[PDB]
Ligand binder design. Structure first.
Ligand code: CDL
Ligand code: CDL
Ligand code: CDL
Ligand code: CDL
Ligand code: HEA
Ligand code: HEA
Ligand code: 9Y0
Ligand code: CU
Ligand code: CU
Ligand code: CU
Lengths: 145, 139, 312, 42, 552, 79, 203
C-alpha cells in the first residue's frame, strides 16, 4: 500500500486527502473541457430515457477484450441495468457490455449501431466525438425498464 | 477559556489606560477641558471589554480545561454530542424585512409604517424564537 | 529638484508655510527611503522563484525570528519618534497666538461664499487707527414672559437659554468684502505684516484653505461653543500678488464654487485700499483705484448654469 | 414518530412521456410541471 | 481497481435547487457565498458611481453631472464601497472559511448569521434607494458631518434613508460579530488551542471586537442624528458641541471602521503567503500580537481625522497615530519574512497578494504623512487623502479580497478559476489602479480639495484628472475578466478532485473536500501546530517544521 | 482640453491596454492537457465514466451487497 | 422511526453541554450586551457634551426633575433585577412554574417602571421641557427613552420566553434562554443605575 507520490495522506477515516502543486490540475483528462461536458451531458440526460446507467471506458482492455469488458462493467455502480462501452485505442478495439436487466429493451439490437457509430468517428480521428455518438445511438435504442 | 478571557483582559487594560490618559490630558491641555465624548466612549469601551473579559474569566474558573483549550488534545477527546444548531430556517429573512419596514418608516417619518414594522418585527422574532418549540397541532 | 520632490506642494508664501514645506520635504524623503527599501525587499524576494532545480526538498521553513523581529520593531519606533519630534516643533509654529496682530481679518463663511470683515488693523510701524464695528451683533434670546401655557413655563430658550437661531457668535465689521455668486471675493492683505484670521461659519462647517499658505482651518458654526480654536495667525506674507483660496470641507451642493482670493499688496497699497473702502466704494473699485486688477485673476466666478448641457 | 407515512392514489390523465421528467422536476406526475420553452421565448 | 466518475462534474444543478436554500439557508458556506456575490454586486454598483465622477472630473466644466448629483455620487460610492462592500464582506469571508479554519461544523448562531446577511442586504438596499427619490441620495459626504446633515441642510428623504439604511446594515454587522466571536470562543476543534488557530481566524476575532466596539456607537449617533432631523432634538446643534460631537462620535466609530475593513484581509494575505512561499507564516506569535495591538490602538486614535477642526488634543492623537503605524509595520515585515527564502510560485492568489503589499505600502507611507498635523493641514480634505486611503483600501480590500476569492474559490465551489484570466485581471487592476490614484497625490497636493464636482480650466492639474479618469476606466474594464472568469469557472473550469488545489495549504480548511461537506468535515486531523493541513499532507515535514522553526 | 481628445483617450487607452494584456496572457498555453490524438498511444491511466443517472436504492453504501455482474450482452468492433 | 436516529428527548437542546464547556448562548448574549453598552456610550457622550456646553445651570429653568417619582421607579427596577435573578435560580432547577412566577412578576414590575417613566415624561412635557424645546430636554429624553425602548424590548423578551416555556417541556436549552433574558434585564437595570446617577444625582 502506498499513497500518491507526494502530498496525499490517509485520514482518520477511509478517505484519502490529496493535494496538487498550485500550477497544475487534478483530473488531467486529455480531452477538451467542452466536449467532456458534452459527453457528460449525453451520459447524464441522453440516457435518462434508457433508465440504464451508461458508462464509457477509454482505458485499455487487453488479453480477452470481451472478458475484460465484463469485469470492468462489474465496476459500474449497478451493473444490473448498465451499458458499458469500452474503447482501447492501444488496440483499436471496441467492446460493449450490457447488464441482465438491460436486455430485450432494444439494447441488443442497438449494440451494432452503437459500435458502428463509435468506429466511424474513431477512424475519422475523434475519440470523444465517437464516444458521444455511440452513447447517443445506444441510449436512443434502449427503452425504459 | 484562559486565553479567551486574557484577550479581553488585555484589551480592558489598554482601553482603561487610554481613557484615563485621554481624560487627564483633555481636562488639562485642551481648549474646553474634558472632551466628554471621547472620554465617555473610551470609558464605556473599557466597560465593554471589562464585561466580556469578566464573564470569560468567570467561565474559565468555573470550567475544567476543554479539549479546545487543551494543548495535546486528541480528536476523540472532544468527539461526542455537539449541541443543537438550527437547520434551515426562513424566519431570519422575515425578521430582516420587518426591521427594514420599521427602518424605512423611521427614515420617511411615517408613524403608521413604523408601527406596522414593529408589529412585524415582533411577529418575526416570535416565529424565529418559537420555531423549534412549537408543539404539534392538538386538533 | 525640490519642487518635483515636494509632490506638487506649492512653494509657501509665509514663514509658517516655508517651515511646513521643509517638514513635508523631510517626511517625504523618509517615506520614500522606507518605501524604496521595502520595495527592494519585495522585488528581491521575488527572485526566490520555485527553481526547477528544487528537488523534493521544501524551503528552510524557519519563521519565528525573534532578534530580527525586535530589530524591525525597534527601528520603526525610532523613525516615527524622530518624525513626531519634528512634527511637534513644526506644530509649535502653527498658531503662535501673538497678542499683537498687525491686521485682523474676520473670515465669516456662509453657505457657498465668503465674507471678510477687517476687524482690526494695527501696524507695528505705527498706522491704521482702525477698529471693528460690532453694533450689529444682536442676540435672539427667546426669553418671553410666557409661552403657549398659561403660566409656569416662562421658557428662556433651548441652548444655554438662547435659541439655535442666534448668530451672536458671528462678528461684523465696517468694511465687509462680501463675495457674490458672480463676483469672487478678494480679501486684500498688506505684505510683510502679521495677519490674524478670526474664523466663523454662518450656517454649516466648511474649510478655509489658501493652498499657498500650506495651511487650512475649518470654519465651524460656533467654534467657541464647540471648543474649536477658529482664530489662527500668519506671521508674515513675503510674496505679493493674487493667491487662490478654496473651500475644503463639505458645504452643500455648491461646495466647489466657494473659491476666493487673498491678494497680498504692499502696505501703502493697503493704506490706500482701506482709505478708499472707508470712503464709499466696493472691493473692485478700491482695487482699480490702487491700480490692481479688480476681479479675481487666479479664478473666475464660473457659470451659475447647472452645467454645459442645460439649455441656458 | 408521532406521524404516519402517507400514501395516495391520484387520478392521472399527456402521459408525461414527452416533456419534463422526475429527475428535473421531482413531482412531474403530480401536476402541470412544464411549459414549452417556446412559450417563454415568445 | 478503478472508480466510476462523471466525465465532468455537474455544471449548475437541477432546476429549483438553490432558490429555496437562499431563503432558508442556515449554512455558513452558502451564506458566505451570498455575501461574496452580493458584496461584489455593490462593488460594481458603487464602482460605477466613481466612473460617473471620473467622467465628470475629466474636464473642468460640468459636462453631464450637476453639483448635487456629483455630491450624491461620492456619498453613496464611499458609503456603498465601505459599508455595503467592504465591511459586509469580512463576514462574507468569515462565514466562508472561519468555521472551516477552526474545525467547527457551523457558526455559533447560524440563524443569526443568516439574519446578519439579510440585514446587510436589505439595509444596504434602502440606503442606495435614496437615488430613486426625486431629490436623490444622501448629498452630504460619507462622513456626514453634523450641521450639513441636520434637517435644515440636506432636508431630502434620501439623506434620511441613508441614515436608517446604515442603522439596519449596522445591526447585521454587529450580530455577525457576535457569531464570529462566539464561534471562535466556543466552537473549536478538539485540539485547536487559541494560539494554534490560523491568523485569519485570529484577525476576524479581533475584528469582531472592533465591530462590537464601533458599530453600536454609529447606531447611537445615527439615531441621534435621526432624532435631530425628525424631532429637532438639538442633539447636534452647533451651539452645543454638535459639530465636534458628531465628529467625535462618528470617527470613534469611523477609524475602527477602516480597521475592521483592514485586519480581516491582513489575515487573508497572511493565509496566502505561507502556502505559496512553502514555509510557515513568519512570526505567527508576533502577528497575533500585532493584530491585537492594532485593534487596541485603533479605538484610541480615532480623532486624527479631525486635525483641521482645531478642536482636539492634537499631540495625543498624533502620537498614537504614530504608535499604531508600528504594529502595521511589524505585520508588513512579517509578510516579507514569510516570502523570504521560500519557493515562491506566483499563481493568481500570490499575484494579488503581492500586489496588496506594493499598493498598501505607498498608501501606508502616505498614511504617516497624514499622521503629522502640520502636513495634514495643507493636505487634509484634498485628493492626497483620497489617494491615501484608496492605495490602502483598494490595496487591502480589493487586492486582498481578490486574492481571497482566487485562493478560496476551489474550496467553496470545487472549480479552479482560470490562471490566465486571473493574471489578466490582476495586471489590468494593478496597472489601472496605479494610473488612477498615483497622480491624485499631486492632484491634491496642489490646491484641489476633494468632493469638488467641477474646477476651473484656469486651475491647473487638468491633465492629471484625465490621467486619473483613464486609470479608473482601466479599472472599469479590469472587472470584466474577473466576472467572466467567475462566470465561466463556477459552472465550467478545471475541477479539483483533491484537497489543497494549492499544495502546502494550512489552516485545516485544506483538510476537507474542496467543496466541503455540509458541516465542513468528515475527517478532523490531529491538530498539533499552526499548520494542521500541511502536517497531515506532508508527515515527513512534521519534525522539520519543529526543528527549523526556532532558527528564523 | 480638447474635449474630443480627452474622451477618445479615456475610451481608448483602457481598450488598447486590455487588448495588449489579453494578447500577452490569454494567448498562453493553459494547464488543461492537450487533446489525445488517436495516432499517439493511450498514455493516460484507465478512465471509467458513469452517468449517475438513476436512483441507487438507498444512498448509504452498506446494504448494497454484491448481487453480481450478471452480464447480459456483448459487442465488438475494430474501428 | 424505531425510536429515533437522534437519541434526544428534546428536538431543541443546548448548543453545547454547559457543564464542561461554556454556554454558547450566554457567551453570545454577554457579547451583545457589551455592544449595547457602547450604544449607551454614544448616548452618554451626547448627554455629557450637552452638559458641558450648558452655561452653568445644566437643567434649564423650565425643567425640574421629579426625583420623588424617579427614585421609586429606580427601586422598582432594582427589585425587578433581584426577582429576575430569583427566576434564574428557579431556571437552573427544573422549576418551570417557579421561573414563570418570578419572570411574570419581573415583567409586571418592569412594566410599572415603564409606566412611571411615561408619567414623568408627560409631567415634564406639560412643564415645558420637550425634545424640540431644549437641549437638556432632548438629550435627557433621547437617553432615557432609548433605555425605555430597551426596557420594552426586555418586557417583550420576558413575555416571549414565558410563551415559549408554556409550549414545550423545560430543558437546559430553555433554562439557558431564561438565563440570557435575565442577563439582558440585568444589563438594562445597570445602565439605568448609570443613567439615574448621571441625570438625577450628578446633574
Ligand atoms: C424575491 C426574493 C426576495 C423576497 C423578499 C421578501 C422576503 C419575505 C417573504 C418570504 C417569507 C416566507 C418564506 O420564506 O417562505 C416560507 C414558505 C415555505 O415554508 P416551508 O418551510 O417550506 O413549509 C413547509 C410546510 O408548510 C411546513 O413547514 P413549517 O413547519 O415551517 O410551517 C409553515 C411556515 C410557512 O409560513 C409562511 O409561509 C408565512 C409566509 C410569510 C410571508 C411574509 C410576507 C412579507 C412580505 C414580503 C414582500 C415580497 O410556518 C409558518 O410560519 C406558518 C405560520 C405563519 C406565520 C405568518 C407570519 C407573518 C410574519 C409577518 C412579519 C412582518 C414582516 C413584514 C416585512 O414559503 C411560502 O410558501 C410562501 C411564499 C413566499 C411569500 C411571498 C411573499 C410575497
Ligand atoms: C429573486 C429576486 C427578484 C429579482 C431578481 C430578478 C430575477 C430573479 C431570479 C431568481 C433569483 C434567484 O436567486 O434565483 C436563482 C435563479 C436560478 O434558479 P435556481 O433555483 O437557482 O436553479 C438552481 C441552479 O440552476 C443550480 O444551483 P447552483 O447553486 O449551481 O447555481 C449556480 C450559481 C449560483 O451558485 C450559488 O450557489 C450562488 C448562491 C448565492 C449567490 C447569490 C446570492 C444573492 C442572494 C440575495 C437575494 C437572492 C434571493 O452560480 C453561477 O453559475 C453564477 C456565476 C456567478 C456570476 C459571477 C459573479 C461575479 O437565477 C436566475 O436564473 C436569475 C438570476 C438571479 C440573480 C440575478 C438578478 C439580481 C439582480 C441583477 C444583478 C445585480 C447586479 C448588480 C446590481
Ligand atoms: C438596537 C437594536 C436592538 C437589537 C436587539 C437584538 C440584538 C441581540 C443579539 C445578541 C443576543 C444574543 C443572541 O445571539 O440572540 C439570539 C437570537 C438569535 O437566534 P439564533 O441565531 O438563531 O441562535 C439561537 C439563539 O442563540 C438561542 O437563544 P434565544 O433564541 O433563546 O435568545 C434569547 C433572547 C436573546 O437575548 C437577547 O437578545 C436580549 C434581548 C434584548 C433586546 C431588546 C431590544 C432593545 C432595543 C430597543 C431600543 C431600540 O431571546 C428572547 O427570548 C428575548 C428576545 C426579545 C427581543 C426583543 C426585540 C424587540 C425590538 C423592538 C422593541 C420595540 C421598542 C422600540 C420602539 O437573537 C434574537 O432573538 C434577537 C432578534 C434580533 C432583533 C433585531 C431587531 C431589529
Ligand atoms: C383583531 C382581532 C384579533 C383577534 C385575535 C384573538 C386573540 C385572542 C383569542 C385567543 C386567545 C385564546 O384562545 O386563549 C386561550 C388559550 C388556551 O389554550 P392553551 O392550550 O392554554 O394555549 C393556547 C393554544 O391553544 C396553545 O398554545 P401553546 O400552549 O402552545 O402556547 C403558545 C403561545 C405562543 O403564542 C404567542 O404568540 C405568544 C407570544 C406573544 C407575543 C409576544 C410579544 C407581545 C408584546 C408584549 C408587550 C410587552 C410590553 O400562545 C400563548 O401565549 C397562549 C395563549 C393564547 C393567546 C395568545 C395571545 C395572543 O390560552 C390561555 O390559556 C389563555 C390566554 C389568554 C390570552 C388572550 C389575550 C389575547 C388578546 C385578547 C383579545 C382579543 C383581540 C382583540 C383585539
Ligand atoms: C484599510 C483602510 C485604512 C488603513 C490601514 C489606514 C491606515 C492609516 N491611516 Fe487612514 N484613513 C482611511 C483608511 C485607512 N487608513 C480612510 C478610509 C480615511 C478617510 C479620509 C477622511 O475622511 O479623512 C483615512 C484617513 C486618515 C487620515 C486623515 C486624513 C485627513 O482627513 O486629512 C489620517 C491622518 O491624518 C490617516 C492615517 C493613517 C495612518 C497613520 C495609518 C497607518 O496605521 C497604517 C498605514 C501606514 C503605514 C506607514 C504602514 C506601513 C508601515 C511600514 C512599512 C513600517 C515602516 C514604515 C514606517 C515606520 C513609516 N488616515
Ligand atoms: C472600499 C472603498 C472604496 C473603493 C473600492 C473605491 C474605489 C474607487 N474610488 Fe473611491 N472613495 C472611497 C472609497 C472607495 N473608493 C471613499 C471612502 C471616498 C471618500 C468619500 C467622501 O469623502 O465622501 C472615496 C472618494 C473617491 C473620490 C473623490 C470624490 C470626490 O471627493 O469628489 C474619487 C474620485 O475619483 C474616487 C474614485 C474611485 C475610483 C476611480 C475607484 C475604483 O478603484 C473603483 C473601480 C470601479 C469599478 C469596479 C466599476 C467598474 C464596473 C462597471 C462599470 C460595471 C457596472 C455594473 C453594474 C453596476 C451591474 N473615490
Ligand atoms: C429611529 C427612530 C426615529 C429617530 C430616533 C428617535 C429616538 C427617540 C427614542 C425614544 C424617545 C421616547 C420618548 C418620547 C417622549 C418625550 C417627550 C417629547 O418628545 O416631547 C414632545 C414631542 C413634541 O414636542 P412639541 O412638538 O414641541 O410640542 C410640545 C407640546 N407642548 O414629542 C416628540 O416629538 C417625540 C416623538 C418621538 C417618537 C420616536 C419613536 C421611535 C420609534 C422607532 C421604532 C424603531 C425604528 C428602527 C429604526 C431602524
Ligand atoms: Cu467647501
Ligand atoms: Cu461653506
Ligand atoms: Cu484613521
Amino acid at each position: 500500500e502506498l499513497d500518491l507520490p507526494y502530498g496525499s495522506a490517509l485520514t482518520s477515516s477511509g478517505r484519502i486527502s490529496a493535494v496538487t502543486e498550485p500550477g497544475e490540475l487534478s483530473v488531467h483528462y486529455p480531452f477538451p473541457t467542452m466536449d467532456l461536458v458534452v459527453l457528460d451531458d449525453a451520459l447524464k440526460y441522453g440516457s435518462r430515457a434508457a433508465k440504464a446507467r451508461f458508462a464509457v471506458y477509454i482505458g485499455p482492455l487487453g488479453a480477452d477484450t470481451a472478458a475484460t469488458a465484463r469485469e470492468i462493467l462489474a465496476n459500474v455502480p449497478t451493473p444490473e441495468n448498465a451499458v458499458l462501452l469500452a474503447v482501447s485505442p492501444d488496440q483499436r478495439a471496441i467492446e460493449v457490455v450490457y447488464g441482465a436487466d438491460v436486455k430485450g429493451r432494444g439494447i441488443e439490437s442497438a449494440a451494432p449501431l452503437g459500435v458502428s457509430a463509435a468506429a466511424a468517428s474513431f477512424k475519422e480521428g475523434n475519440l470523444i466525438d465517437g464516444l458521444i455518438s455511440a452513447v447517443r445511438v445506444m441510449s436512443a435504442g434502449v427503452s425504459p425498464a | 477559556m484562559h486565553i479567551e478571557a486574557r484577550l479581553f483582559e488585555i484589551l480592558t487594560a489598554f482601553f482603561a489606560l487610554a481613557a484615563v490618559v485621554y481624560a487627564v490630558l483633555t481636562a488639562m491641555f485642551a481648549t474646553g477641558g474634558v472632551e466628554w465624548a471621547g472620554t465617555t466612549a473610551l470609558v464605556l469601551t473599557t466597560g465593554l471589554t471589562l464585561i466580556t473579559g469578566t464573564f470569560f474569566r468567570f467561565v474559565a474558573r468555573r470550567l475544567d480545561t476543554r479539549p479546545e483549550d487543551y494543548e495535546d488534545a486528541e480528536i476523540s477527546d472532544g468527539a461526542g454530542e455537539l449541541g443543537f444548531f438550527a437547520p434551515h430556517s426562513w424566519w431570519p429573512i422575515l425578521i430582516s424585512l420587518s426591521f427594514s419596514t420599521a427602518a424605512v418608516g423611521a427614515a420617511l417619518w411615517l408613524p403608521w409604517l413604523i408601527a406596522a414594522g414593529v408589529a412585524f418585527v415582533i411577529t418575526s422574532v416570535c416565529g424565529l424564537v418559537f420555531e423549534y418549540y412549537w408543539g404539534p397541532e392538538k386538533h | 529638484w525640490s519642487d518635483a520632490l515636494a509632490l506638487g506642494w506649492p512653494t509657501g508664501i509665509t514663514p509658517e508655510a516655508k517651515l511646513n514645506r521643509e517638514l513635508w520635504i523631510g517626511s517625504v524623503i523618509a517615506s520614500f527611503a522606507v518605501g524604496a527599501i521595502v520595495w527592494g525587499l519585495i522585488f528581491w524576494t521575488s527572485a526566490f522563484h520555485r527553481k526547477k532545480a528544487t528537488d523534493t526538498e521544501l524551503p528552510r521553513q524557519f519563521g519565528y525570528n525573534m532578534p530580527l523581529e525586535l530589530t524591525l520593531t525597534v527601528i520603526p519606533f525610532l523613525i516615527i519618534s524622530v518624525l513626531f519630534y519634528f512634527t511637534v516643533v513644526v506644530q509649535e509654529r502653527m498658531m503662535h497666538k501673538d497678542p499683537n496682530p498687525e491686521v485682523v481679518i474676520d473670515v465669516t463663511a456662509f453657505q457657498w461664499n465668503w465674507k471678510f470683515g477687517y476687524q482690526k488693523i494695527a501696524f507695528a510701524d505705527g498706522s491704521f487707527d482702525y477698529d471693528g464695528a460690532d453694533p450689529e451683533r444682536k442676540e435672539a434670546m427667546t426669553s418671553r414672559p410666557e409661552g403657549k401655557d398659561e403660566h409656569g413655563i416662562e421658557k428662556v430658550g433651548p441652548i444655554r437659554g438662547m435659541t439655535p437661531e442666534d448668530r451672536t457668535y458671528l462678528n461684523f465689521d465696517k468694511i465687509e468684502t462680501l463675495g457674490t455668486s458672480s463676483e469672487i471675493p478678494v480679501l486684500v492683505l498688506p505684505a510683510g505684516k502679521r495677519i490674524e484670521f478670526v474664523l466663523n461659519s454662518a450656517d454649516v462647517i466648511h474649510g478655509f484653505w489658501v493652498p499657498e499658505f500650506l495651511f487650512k482651518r475649518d470654519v465651524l458654526p460656533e467654534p467657541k461653543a464647540n471648543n474649536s480654536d477658529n482664530v489662527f495667525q500668519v506671521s508674515e506674507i513675503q510674496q505679493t500678488g493674487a493667491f487662490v483660496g478654496r473651500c475644503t470641507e463639505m458645504c452643500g451642493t455648491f461646495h466647489a464654487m466657494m473659491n476666493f482670493e487673498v491678494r497680498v499688496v504692499e502696505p501703502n497699497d493697503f493704506k490706500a485700499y482701506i482709505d478708499q473702502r472707508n470712503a464709499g466704494k466696493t472691493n473692485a473699485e478700491a482695487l482699480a483705484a490702487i491700480n490692481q486688477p479688480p476681479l479675481a485673476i487666479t479664478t473666475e466666478p464660473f457659470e451659475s448654469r447647472r452645467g454645459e448641457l442645460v439649455p441656458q | 414518530m408521532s406521524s404516519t407515512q402517507d400514501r395516495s392514489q391520484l387520478d392521472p390523465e399527456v402521459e408525461r412521456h414527452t416533456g419534463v421528467d422526475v429527475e428535473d422536476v421531482p413531482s412531474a406526475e403530480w401536476g402541470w410541471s412544464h411549459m414549452p420553452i417556446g412559450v417563454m421565448h415568445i | 481497481e478503478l472508480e466510476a466518475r462523471r466525465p465532468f462534474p455537474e455544471r449548475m444543478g437541477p432546476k429549483g435547487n438553490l432558490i429555496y436554500k437562499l431563503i432558508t439557508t442556515t449554512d455558513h458556506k452558502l451564506i458566505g457565498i451570498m455575501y461574496c456575490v452580493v458584496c461584489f454586486a455593490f462593488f460594481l454598483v458603487g464602482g460605477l458611481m466613481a466612473l460617473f465622477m471620473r467622467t465628470e472630473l475629466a474636464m473642468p466644466g460640468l459636462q453631464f453631472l450637476s453639483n448635487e448629483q456629483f455630491n450624491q455620487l461620492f456619498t453613496m460610492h464611499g458609503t456603498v464601497m465601505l459599508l455595503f462592500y467592504a465591511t459586509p464582506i469580512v463576514f462574507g469571508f468569515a462565514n466562508l472559511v472561519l468555521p472551516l479554519q477552526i474545525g467547527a461544523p457551523d457558526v455559533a448562531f447560524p440563524r443569526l448569521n443568516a439574519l446578519s446577511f439579510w440585514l446587510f442586504l436589505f439595509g444596504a438596499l434602502i440606503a442606495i434607494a435614496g437615488f430613486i427619490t426625486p431629490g436623490g441620495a444622501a448629498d452630504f459626504g460619507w462622513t456626514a458631518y453634523s450641521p450639513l446633515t441636520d434637517a435644515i441642510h440636506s432636508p431630502g428623504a434620501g439623506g434620511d434613508l441613508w441614515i436608517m439604511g446604515l442603522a439596519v446594515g449596522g445591526l447585521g454587522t454587529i450580530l455577525g460579530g457576535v457569531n464570529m466571536i462566539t464561534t471562535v470562543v466556543c466552537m473549536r476543534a478538539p485540539g485547536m488551542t487559541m494560539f494554534r488557530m490560523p491568523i485569519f481566524t485570529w484577525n476576524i476575532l479581533v475584528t469582531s471586537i472592533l465591530v462590537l466596539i464601533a458599530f453600536p456607537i454609529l447606531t447611537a449617533a445615527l439615531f441621534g442624528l435621526a432624532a435631530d432631523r425628525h424631532l429637532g432634538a438639538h442633539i447636534y446643534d452647533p451651539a452645543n458641541g454638535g459639530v465636534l460631537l458628531w465628529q467625535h462620535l462618528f470617527w470613534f466609530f469611523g477609524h475602527p471602521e477602516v480597521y475592521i475593513i483592514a485586519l480581516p484581509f491582513f489575515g487573508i494575505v497572511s493565509e496566502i503567503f505561507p502556502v505559496f512561499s512553502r514555509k510557515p507564516i513568519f512570526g505567527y506569535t508576533t502577528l497575533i500580537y500585532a493584530t491585537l495591538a492594532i485593534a487596541a490602538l485603533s479605538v484610541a486614535v480615532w480623532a486624527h481625522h479631525m486635525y483641521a477642526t482645531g478642536a482636539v488634543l492634537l499631540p495625543f492623537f498624533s502620537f498614537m497615530t504614530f504608535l499604531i503605524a508600528v504594529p502595521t509595520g511589524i505585520k508588513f515585515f512579517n509578510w516579507i519574512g514569510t516570502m523570504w527564502k521560500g519557493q515562491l510560485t506566483f499563481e493568481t492568489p500570490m499575484l494579488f497578494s503581492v500586489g496588496f503589499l506594493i499598493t498598501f505600502l505607498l498608501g501606508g507611507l502616505s498614511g504617516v504623512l497624514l499622521a503629522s498635523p502640520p502636513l495634514d493641514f495643507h493636505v487634509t480634505d484634498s485628493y492626497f487623502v483620497i489617494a491615501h486611503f484608496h492605495y490602502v483600501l483598494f490595496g487591502t480590500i480589493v487586492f486582498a479580497t481578490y486574492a481571497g476569492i482566487y485562493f478560496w474559490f476551489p474550496k467553496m465551489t470545487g472549480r479552479l478559476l482560470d490562471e490566465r484570466l486571473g493574471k489578466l485581471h490582476f495586471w489590468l487592476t494593478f496597472i489601472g489602479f496605479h494610473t488612477t490614484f498615483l497622480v491624485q497625490h499631486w492632484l491634491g497636493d496642489e490646491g484641489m480639495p476633494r468632493r469638488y464636482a467641477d474646477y476651473l480650466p484656469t486651475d491647473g492639474f487638468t491633465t492629471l484628472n484625465v490621467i486619473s479618469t483613464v486609470g479608473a476606466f482601466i479599472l472599469g474594464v479590469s472587472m470584466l475578466p474577473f466576472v467572466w472568469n467567475v462566470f465561466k469557472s463556477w459552472r465550467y473550469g478545471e475541477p479539483v478532485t483533491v484537497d489543497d488545489p494549492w499544495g502546502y495549504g494550512n489552516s485545516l480548511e485544506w483538510a476537507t473536500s474542496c467543496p466541503p461537506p455540509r458541516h465542513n468535515f468528515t475527517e478532523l486531523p490531529r491538530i498539533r501546530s499552526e499548520r494542521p493541513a500541511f502536517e497531515l499532507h506532508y508527515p515527513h515535514m512534521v519534525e522539520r517544521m519543529r526543528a527549523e522553526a526556532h532558527v528564523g | 482640453m480638447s474635449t474630443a481628445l480627452t474622451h477618445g483617450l479615456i475610451g481608448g487607452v483602457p481598450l488598447v491596454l486590455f487588448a495588449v494584456l489579453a494578447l500577452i496572457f490569454l494567448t498562453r498555453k493553459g494547464p488543461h492537457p492537450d487533446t489525445y490524438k488517436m495516432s499517439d498511444p493511450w498514455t493516460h491511466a484507465p478512465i471509467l465514466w458513469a452517468a449517475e443517472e438513476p436512483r441507487e436504492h438507498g444512498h448509504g453504501g452498506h446494504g448494497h451487497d454484491s448481487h453480481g455482474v450478471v452480464i447480459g450482452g456483448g459487442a465488438s468492433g475494430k474501428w | 422511526m424505531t425510536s429515533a436516529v437522534g437519541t434526544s428527548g428534546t428536538a431543541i437542546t443546548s448548543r453545547v453541554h454547559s457543564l464542561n464547556r461554556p454556554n454558547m448562548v450566554s457567551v453570545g448574549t454577554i457579547v451583545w450586551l457589551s455592544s449595547e453598552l457602547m450604544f449607551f456610550a454614544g448616548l452618554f457622550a451626547m448627554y455629557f457634551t450637552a452638559r458641558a456646553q450648558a452655561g452653568g445651570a445644566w437643567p434649564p429653568e423650565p425643567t425640574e426633575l421629579n426625583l420623588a417619582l424617579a427614585v421609586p421607579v429606580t427601586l422598582v427596577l432594582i427589585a425587578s433585577s433581584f426577582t429576575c435573578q430569583m427566576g434564574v435560580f428557579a431556571a437552573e432547577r427544573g422549576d418551570v412554574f417557579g421561573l414563570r412566577r418570578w419572570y411574570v412578576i419581573t415583567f409586571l414590575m418592569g412594566l410599572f417602571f415603564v409606566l412611571g417613566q411615561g408619567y414623568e415624561y408627560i409631567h415634564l412635557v406639560e412643564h415645558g421641557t420637550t425634545i424640540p424645546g431644549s437641549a437638556y430636554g432632548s438629550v435627557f429624553y433621547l437617553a432615557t427613552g432609548f433605555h425605555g425602548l430597551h426596557v420594552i424590548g426586555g418586557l417583550v423578551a420576558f413575555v416571549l420566553l414565558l410563551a415559549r416555556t408554556k409550549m414545550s417541556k423545560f430543558t437546559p436549552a430553555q433554562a439557558t434562554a431564561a438565563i440570557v433574558v435575565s442577563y439582558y434585564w440585568h444589563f438594562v437595570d445597570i445602565v439605568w443605575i448609570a443613567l439615574f446617577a448621571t441625570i438625577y444625582f450628578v446633574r
